[PDB]
Each structure stands twice: as structure tokens, then as C-alpha cells.
Amino acid sequence: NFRVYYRDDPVWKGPAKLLEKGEGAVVIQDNSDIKVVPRRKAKIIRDYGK
Amino acid sequence: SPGIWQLDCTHLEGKVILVAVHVASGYIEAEVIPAETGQETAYFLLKLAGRWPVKTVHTDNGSNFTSTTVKAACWWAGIKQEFGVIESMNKELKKIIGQVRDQAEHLKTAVQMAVFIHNKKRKGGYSAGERIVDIIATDI
Amino acid sequence: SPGIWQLDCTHLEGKVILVAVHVASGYIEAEVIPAETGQETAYFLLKLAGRWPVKTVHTDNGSNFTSTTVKAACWWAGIKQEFQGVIESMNKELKKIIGQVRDQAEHLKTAVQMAVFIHNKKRKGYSAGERIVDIIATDIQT
Amino acid sequence: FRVYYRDDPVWKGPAKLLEKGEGAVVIQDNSDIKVVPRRKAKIIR
Numbered sequence A: 001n002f003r004v005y006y007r008d009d010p011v012w013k014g015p016a017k018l019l020e021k022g023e024g025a026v027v028i029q030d031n032s033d034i035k036v037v038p039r040r041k042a043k044i045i046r047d048y049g050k
Numbered sequence B: 001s002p003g004i005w006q007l008d009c010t011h012l013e014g015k016v017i018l019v020a021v022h023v024a025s026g027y028i029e030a031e032v033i034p035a036e037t038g039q040e041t042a043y044f045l046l047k048l049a050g051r052w053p054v055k056t057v058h059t060d061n062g063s064n065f066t067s068t069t070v071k072a073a074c075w076w077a078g079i080k081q082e083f084g085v086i087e088s089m090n091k092e093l094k095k096i097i098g099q100v101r102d103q104a105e106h107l108k109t110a111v112q113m114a115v116f117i118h119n120k121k122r123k124g125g126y127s128a129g130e131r132i133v134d135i136i137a138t139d140i
Numbered sequence C: 001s002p003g004i005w006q007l008d009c010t011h012l013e014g015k016v017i018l019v020a021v022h023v024a025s026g027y028i029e030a031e032v033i034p035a036e037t038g039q040e041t042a043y044f045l046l047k048l049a050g051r052w053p054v055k056t057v058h059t060d061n062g063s064n065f066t067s068t069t070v071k072a073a074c075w076w077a078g079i080k081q082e083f084q085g086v087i088e089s090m091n092k093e094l095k096k097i098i099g100q101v102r103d104q105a106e107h108l109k110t111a112v113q114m115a116v117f118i119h120n121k122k123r124k125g126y127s128a129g130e131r132i133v134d135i136i137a138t139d140i141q142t
Numbered sequence D: 001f002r003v004y005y006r007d008d009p010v011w012k013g014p015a016k017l018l019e020k021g022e023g024a025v026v027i028q029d030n031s032d033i034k035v036v037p038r039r040k041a042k043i044i045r
Ligand SMILES: Cc1ccc(C2CC2)c(-c2ccc3c(c2)CCCO3)c1[C@H](OC1CC1)C(=O)O
Pocket: B103, B104, B105, B106, B107, B109, B110, B113, C039, C040, C042, C043, C068, C069, C070, C072, C073, C076, D004, D011, D042, D044
């Protein structure tokens, strides 16, 4: 439903699983690694086309 | 299938031409992009997906097609990615461009003239532009 | 008529958005052009004419629409030019969808195409993208 | 079969194509016989 794309490296990483959305950061899981990414450096894109 | 497309890049005069073909009809769309990047490729797909029911896109392993930006566009638009119709179409497009090249200053103008000529030509009888509209309307 | 279109330019973030609407269906196509000139307008029409059976285009008296470059493009593609409500109402509708999704993308051109996608895929059920394909295919098959 | 040209950066035309040379084109615009260089002419079929 939701997929998160992020930057750590200007190359955009992802897609990652959305674990939690905070007011200043998002918690994601890329592969087996849990990452905390600020809101400004993340893109939570929904499968709108469906 | 009415929703399968093939995309690939061809080159003329040092410029990058991104071509999309509707496999079931031969209908084509092309655009000269300033760089062969995932950002330009994803923007091309977003425009295409808003015009036609794009369900599956078949490309080679080009770095612009496997880029993260394209994956995000296909995910948002609900497009599935899979990795000789498009190759035969690039040569067909290149041939019409060479026949009309001297009629325009810019290559991008000749490209769209060639896309116009290809999509409007009947077999001998429907054109590729008529077939894709026919195939999609029947699917509705 | 299945071949009547309306074209007009709107502005957001200092950028020029050229919009084309299929009157009989409400289907839209938009593009952010680097300049509001006849050359950019003619190139847009050449892409549109290779896409749909464009027979008549209705515009205002903007200098880009009355330019010689656009007249040359309309002649080559066999397009008749005529010089309101539909495109004016569609510029506001497009701007409304862009404002709802603007923060989802860095570039304005990404938001315009997301809004074009949203507008053409929204049903009522019949969506605008389904209507133009249905209207044009009915003219072909009959 | 149609010639657009520049005499003024505004493109003039359409004019009738009479002859296409390697460095110039002979055209008729309105009732005038004009001769225009190749670089300042658009010969569209
Ligand atoms: C730059 C330029 C300047 C003047 C004109 C015309 C005669 C005034 C054109 C032009 C327009 C339409 C057209 C053709 C040429 C040739 C065949 C298809 O229809 C162009 C054209 O680019 C513009 C984006 C289309 C180009 O690439 O030459």
C-alpha cells in the first residue's frame, strides 16, 4: 500500500517498508535494516494507480 | 494484452530519444529528453500513464529504466515492470526521421513528424493510432 | 464532435503550463513549456496531433496561438483553428489537484502530471480517459 | 509545397514554391516574386 523512498548519498534509496510515521522522522525497514529518516529526506508514495 | 508497453532509448545527432510502443497496435510515442536519466524516464512514464491504461512496461536493463525514480513512478501509477518490437520500431522511426529531417531545423520536430506519420498510416485497413483506440475501448 | 480541442496557458510558480482538453470527454493533457511562445506551442500541438484525431483547436487570441509557427503546424497536421468555459474551468480544476499533491514532489512538472493522471482516471461510472477512447473508437468503427 | 521565410524575425508565408536551389529559393508571396536564401526558408511538404 505504502512504499518509502529516502536518501542517506544523493542517490534515492528504496523501496522500503513503512514501519512508523512520526512528525519529524519516519521509521523504515530496507531489506533487514531498520532506519530512521527525517521527513524532509523521505518520500512515502502510495500505490495510487491500483 | 491491451496494457503492455515497451520502452527504449535511441540516439540521433547526439540527442536521446525515448520511445514507447503499444505492442498490440504498433502505436508509438517519442520524446527527446535532455539526459538519459531515471528522472527524465520517470517523468515520461507519468505522462504516458495519464493518457493510456499502462499496465506493464517491458524495457532492457538500462540504468535509467532500473533507477529508483522509475520504480517510484511505476509504483504510484500501478505499473508492473518486466526486464524485438521496440528494436524494429526504433529503426522504423529513424527511417521516417531521415526522410523528413531537412523539413525542420530541430531534430525533436522531425521526431514528432515521424511519430505522426507512423501512427496515421493505414495498412493498405487501419492505422496504429486507430488500433490502440479500438483495442482499449473494447477492453472497457 | 470527437475532434474538437481547447488549448490555453496557465501559470504556477512562474512556470507556463500548456493545457489541452478534449471537449466532448473532459480528457486533458498538460505540459510545462520553457516559454509561452509559438514554437513551444507548435511542438505541443505536433505531439498532440500524432496522439489523437485533432481536427479543430479553440484558443484565445494569445500571441503564441496566433503565431505563424502554430499556423504552420496546424496546416501540416490538417488542424483548423478557431478563436472559453471548458478550458477556463479546467485550468482551475487542474490547479486544485496540483495544490493537493504539490508537497508530494519536488518539481512542479511532476505534480502537473500527477494531477493529469488523477483527473483522467477519476470516474464520474465513466472516467474522462475512458470517454475520449470510447468517443473516438465509436467514430472509427462506424 | 509551402514556403515560410524571414525577410524582421517574424516568419512570413505561406508562399508558393517555384524553385529550390542549393543556396536560394524562388517563391511567390502574394503577387511578388521573392528570392530567399536556404537558411531563411522553411520548405514543408
Ligand atoms: C524552429 C521553427 C521555426 C519556424 C517554424 C515554422 C514555419 C514557421 C517551425 C516549424 C513549425 C511546424 C512545422 C514545421 C516547422 C515543419 C513541418 C511540421 O510543421 C520550426 C520548427 O520547430 C517548431 C516546434 C515546431 C522546426 O524544427 O523547424
